[PDB]
Amino acid sequence: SFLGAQLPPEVAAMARLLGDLDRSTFRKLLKFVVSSLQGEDCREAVQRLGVSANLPEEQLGALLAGMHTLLQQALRLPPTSLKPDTFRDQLQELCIPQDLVGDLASVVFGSQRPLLDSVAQQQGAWLPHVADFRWRVDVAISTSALARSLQPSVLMQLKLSDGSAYRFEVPTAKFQELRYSVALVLKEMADLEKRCERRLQD
């Protein structure tokens, strides 16, 4: 099962609560789960839904926790690996009512999915990225130590997505090492991609 070898306790709890729940309330809750996955703050809207449904907060918490887990584990699977027929079968082993299964399936496979995939791909980053890169190229004509220098250098400034920024000067012997290193890594990324496509894809 896409839920792993042993059913998470929050999913088992939620699946027995669904028998008592009006489909109108289920579909209202499901929107909050999906929009929370896209990063939207929903806390006040959930509270209003609670008193509207007369759900105590102990049951809201169990329902919301169980729905989040089910969608998280399904949406992390590529379309090669979970497909509508096997998803629908596996959810029926949880004894989820068939009408609610259709609503869940529409979230995992319908037109909501591409925006969810975009948000899920953002979470692979762990180190910061280059946000900006600026330079100037200078030639030194004279200096305190030399009447004539005539030596080039590159002044560089990086801004990272961390919000950190660095300004530093690069000797041309050091720029050659940087340029070499970057082209080398690009060759070795391309070689690794060809290993993967010819051995891991089959």
């Binding site: 030639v139 004509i141 004539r148 005539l150 030596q151 080039p152 041309t172 012997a173 050659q176 090492e177 340029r179 070499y180 082209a183 080398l184 690009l186 060759k187 391309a190």
Partner: protein
């Protein structure tokens, strides 16, 4: 445990015994008998014979698995020993560990020194015409050929034909900076020299 240790290119999904009853043990016995021929196990075994557990007949099956498992650990390394050592290093340190931590920095310095002595340095410069831009791969290959880091031979040779040799490591100018000094600043230099004459 021997099966999963081998990793012999099969989608081996199966469950350990867990002191399970009849039922689970039967399903596992079918799976083991299914996996063995895909591993090219020379010795046959049967699911009923697993339940009766004919040690005399299961012994050669185990001999295959144990021999293959040992070989695989000898190349991949013993994980459980590495865990035991990691539990030591978390709170203890042998005299040879303290020694290594002491001399670590001076050792590291020697290899970054050698890396600078023998760094790749730019031997060639490519022409600005006949744009190589047509794909990323031939641009990146052309860049590495500038450092000598070479139809594979024909690809190199057609790329190498777009290049000129070099002999200098730092780009120091032959006083040609006057051309860019005068050609763009000199009017401003004339204004400033005139005004700071007139002001005094």
């Amino acid at each position: 445990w021997c099966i999963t240790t081998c990793n012999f290119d099969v989608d081996v999904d199966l469950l350990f015994q867990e002191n399970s009853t009849i039922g689970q043990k039967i399903a596992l016995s079918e799976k083991i008998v299914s996996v063995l021929p895909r591993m090219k196990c020379p010795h046959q075994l049967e699911p009923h014979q697993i339940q009766g557990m004919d040690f005399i007949h299961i012994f050669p099956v185990v001999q295959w698995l144990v021999k293959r498992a040992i070989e695989t650990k000898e190349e991949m390394g013993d994980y459980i020993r590495s865990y035991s050592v990691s539990q030591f290093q978390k709170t203890y340190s042998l005299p040879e560990d303290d020694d290594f931590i002491k001399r670590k920095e001076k050792a590291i310095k020697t290899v970054v020194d050698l890396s600078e002595v023998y760094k790749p340095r730019r031997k060639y410069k490519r022409h600005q015409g006949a744009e190589e831009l047509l794909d990323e791969e031939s641009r990146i290959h052309a860049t590495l050929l500038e450092y000598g880091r070479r139809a594979e031979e024909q690809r190199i040779q057609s790329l190498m034909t777009k290049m000129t040799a070099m002999a200098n490591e730092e780009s120091r100018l032959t006083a040609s900076s006057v051309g860019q000094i005068v050609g763009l600043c000199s009017a401003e230099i004339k204004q400033i020299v005139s005004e700071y004459a007139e002001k005094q």
